[PDB]
């Protein structure tokens, strides 16, 4: 009789202490609201730019709207960032300064004639680390006024030290109509063989066939290494097949060895589409479970169709 009261009181105290999580969690957000309300107290800041400076303590500022003014020096900030050539900020009162306003294997060759899926690997690396997010279009020309645009992009590449370049379908630009093309090529040569540090920035090129790819431009100089991908690796294909077999339940007896072995000259995304097509083919039998027999047949047929349409 006395032993059950402890359990009962444990239940009451339990449901009493379990109702706090519906409050104390959102109280932090409610407090954060007023915190933001107190964070909105700072207003009336304007901008400015520094050109000429006479006195080290007090310099001249240039507004974006075009009128010119002069300000002093705040006891907080130092003379380190006070140097000219840096866009700063100003206040509507006393024209003080809260802070400033900052402005905003060296090569590889990938040729894809047997199929595709290199972009899937590049996407895998990009989703892995990639050190940054950047993409270079195949043709920046149609966007002779694109030269300054290329030099601008490379200027940004010099601005941000870490860089990785991804270029897909470069065989299009690899091929007075031809004269301007040759001129653009000469510009590319001038830019790549100019003065720059390639030990950091990395470039990746994706393409189709080794014809318009300019083997002279595929030279060791303008491209260190070349890697040929015929198809995803056996371990890689098995792995991606395993992770694609995760959400879909199958029969107790399962063999991926047949699926992997019978697959020749196929691509990951394509094979995934074949798998989904096999699922939609096996959904016609309205069964919750699907044997690998129908899977093997459907995969075989669909892949054969893809081989017939591979032209």
């Amino acid at each position: 009789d006395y032993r059950k009261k402890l359990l009962e009181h444990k239940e009451i105290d339990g449901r009493l202490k379990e109702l706090r999580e519906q409050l104390k969690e959102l109280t932090k957000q409610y407090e954060k609201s007023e915190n933001d309300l107190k964070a909105l107290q700072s207003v009336g800041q304007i901008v400015g730019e520094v050109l000429k400076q006479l006195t080290e303590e007090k310099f001249i500022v240039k507004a974006t709207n075009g009128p010119r003014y002069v300000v002093g020096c705040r006891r907080q900030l130092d003379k380190s960032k006070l140097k000219p050539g840096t866009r700063v900020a100003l206040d509507m009162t006393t024209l003080t300064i809260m802070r400033y306003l900052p402005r905003e294997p060296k090569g590889c060759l990938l040729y894809g004639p047997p199929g595709t899926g290199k972009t899937l690997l590049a996407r895998a690396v990009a989703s892995q680390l990639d050190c940054n997010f950047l993409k270079v279009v195949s043709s920046s020309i149609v966007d002779g006024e694109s030269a300054r645009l290329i030099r601008e992009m490379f200027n940004y590449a010099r601005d941000h030290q870490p860089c990785i370049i991804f270029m897909d379908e470069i065989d299009a630009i690899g091929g007075s109509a031809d004269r301007e093309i040759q001129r653009t090529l000469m510009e590319l040569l001038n830019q790549m063989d100019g003065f720059d540090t390639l030990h950091r920035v990395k470039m990746i090129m994706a393409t189709n066939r080794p014809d318009t790819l300019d083997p002279a431009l595929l030279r060791p100089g303008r491209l260190d290494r070349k890697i040929h991908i015929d198809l995803p690796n056996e371990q890689a294909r098995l792995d991606i097949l395993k992770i694609h077999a995760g959400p879909i339940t199958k029969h107790g007896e399962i063999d991926y060895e047949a699926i992997v072995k019978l697959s020749d000259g196929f691509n990951g995304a394509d094979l995934r589409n074949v798998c989904t097509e096999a699922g939609m083919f096996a959904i016609r039998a309205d069964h919750d479970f699907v044997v690998q027999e129908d899977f093997m047949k459907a995969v075989r047929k669909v892949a054969d169709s893809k081989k017939l349409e591979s032209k």
């Binding site: 047997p114 083997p215 070349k226 040929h228």
Partner: protein, 152 residues
């Protein structure tokens, strides 16, 4: 396609047992055109993973009982890129070469303990020059041969 070369390979391993190196010399023009053809990169991988094993098997037979080793090293010394001379198109496989050199240095590793005194210094003085002449490698076997030479 390597399907035709496979029959030649597994036929070769059966037909070649007690025969001398003359049959290999007769096998040279046969393997020459075989190296000339097969433009396909992926297809002939098997053929390159077979025929090489066959000729190295013949080399094993020649190095089994009686070995002059002069002609053996002279053949490879005189012929390196000779098979690739007729082909203007760049092979750029960079696949079977590693396994090739690894197998060669594997056999050389089996013979590295005790065989005979004279040929080994010639083989080493040849391959250390091959390191320089090659200029492209995974930089494994190249260090292997020279460090295993250094140990001596």
């Amino acid at each position: 396609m390597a399907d035709g070369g496979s029959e030649r390979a597994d036929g070769r391993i059966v037909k070649m047992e007690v025969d001398y190196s003359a049959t290999v010399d007769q096998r040279l023009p046969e393997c020459a055109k075989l190296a000339k053809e097969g433009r396909l990169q992926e297809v002939i991988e098997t053929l390159l993973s077979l025929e090489k094993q066959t000729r190295t098997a013949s080399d094993m037979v020649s190095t089994s009982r009686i070995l002059v080793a002069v002609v053996k090293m002279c053949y490879e010394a005189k012929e390196w890129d000779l098979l690739n001379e007729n082909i203007m198109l760049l092979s750029k496989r960079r696949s079977q070469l590693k396994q090739a050199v690894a197998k060669m240095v594997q056999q050389c590793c089996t013979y590295v303990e005790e065989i005979t005194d004279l040929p080994i210094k010639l083989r080493l003085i040849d391959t250390l020059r091959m390191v320089t002449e090659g200029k492209i490698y995974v930089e494994i076997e190249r260090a292997r041969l020279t460090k295993t030479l250094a140990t001596i």
